[PDB]
Structure 1
Amino acid sequence: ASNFTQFVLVDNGGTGDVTVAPSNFANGVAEWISSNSRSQAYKVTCSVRQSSAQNRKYTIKVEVPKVATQTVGGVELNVAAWRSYLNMELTIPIFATNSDCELIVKAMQGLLKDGNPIPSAIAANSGIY
């Protein structure tokens, strides 16, 4: 069994989906990268570690690139004009049962569901109002 597999990061219908695939798992940091030029690739990393005697802590990171071509002196390269960086830390006490964790996951999914405040603000270059 393995959960270190490829998955769909961006569900753009069924065509133009960004799939991210495993690439390296060094030093306890799982890393996934989308295909093609590493320079324009999406990146996701995840690591879990015991932060204190009572808590475990997950550190997830995602990079969404803005695909572009750079032309310097007539030489064109595939690059990322810029990147957005998502950095999240999740602390969970060791007393949390599997049920408790499922709830935590649902809270995260709910937080970002379409239509809700946070995702609507982000999607529209806006804050709360």
Structure 2
Amino acid sequence: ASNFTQFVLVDNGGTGDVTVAPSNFANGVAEWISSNSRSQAYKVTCSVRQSSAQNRKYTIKVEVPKVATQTVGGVELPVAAWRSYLNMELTIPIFATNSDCELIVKAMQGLLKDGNPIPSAIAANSGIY
């Protein structure tokens, strides 16, 4: 085992599929990036900390880039027009068993499942109403 493996971040049925691979673990922060210039890459980082006497806190971040080709000084450089950032912090009490944690993961998956409220609003550039 070793869970520090590559995985598909964006799935488009095996074509134009954004896959992300391990790329750094310096300072206890696991990092994953896509095969791109460090300036246009998708980035995912994760770290766990004993935030308190009875808490553990996962801090996960994702960076989704809008790739573009700029012309600085009359030369073409691969760059990102802009980036979208996901910042999630998950605090779990040390008393949570494995089955308790599986419950947290399922909640997070159901929360974002296609057709459910939240992902629908985000995808349509609107709020909940």
TM-score, with length taken from structure 1: 0.98
Structure-1 separation of matches of 2:21 and 2:39: 15
Instruction: Give the drift of 1:13.
Output: 1.5
Identity across aligned pairs (percent)? Answer: 99
SS at match of 2:65: strand
Instruction: Give the drift of 1:36.
Output: 1.9
1:19-40 CA distance string (max 9 Å, x none):
1011100111000010021110
Instruction: Give the drift of 1:87.
Output: 0.2
Trace 1:78-97 onto structure 2 (pairs within 5 A).
Answer: 78-97=78-97
Structure-2 separation of matches of 1:74 and 1:61: 34
Instruction: Give the drift of 1:74.
Output: 2.2
Instruction: Give the drift of 1:72.
Output: 2.3
Structure-2 separation of matches of 1:24 and 1:78: 22
SS at match of 1:2: coil
Q: How many residues align?
A: 129
Instruction: Give the drift of 1:123.
Output: 0.6
What residue is the counterpart of 1:49 in the other structure? 49
Structure-2 separation of matches of 1:104 and 1:91: 11
Structure-2 separation of matches of 1:14 and 1:20: 14
Structure-1 separation of matches of 2:2 and 2:123: 33
SS at match of 2:96: coil
How large is the Cα RMSD of the aligned pairs? 0.7
1:67-95 CA distance string (max 9 Å, x none):
10101232010000000000000000001
Instruction: Give the drift of 1:48.
Output: 0.3
SS at match of 1:114: coil
Structure-1 separation of matches of 2:13 and 2:81: 25
Q: Which runs of 4+ in 1 moved over 3 A?
A: none
Structure-2 separation of matches of 1:48 and 1:116: 29
Instruction: Give the drift of 1:102.
Output: 0.3
Instruction: Give the drift of 1:14.
Output: 1.1
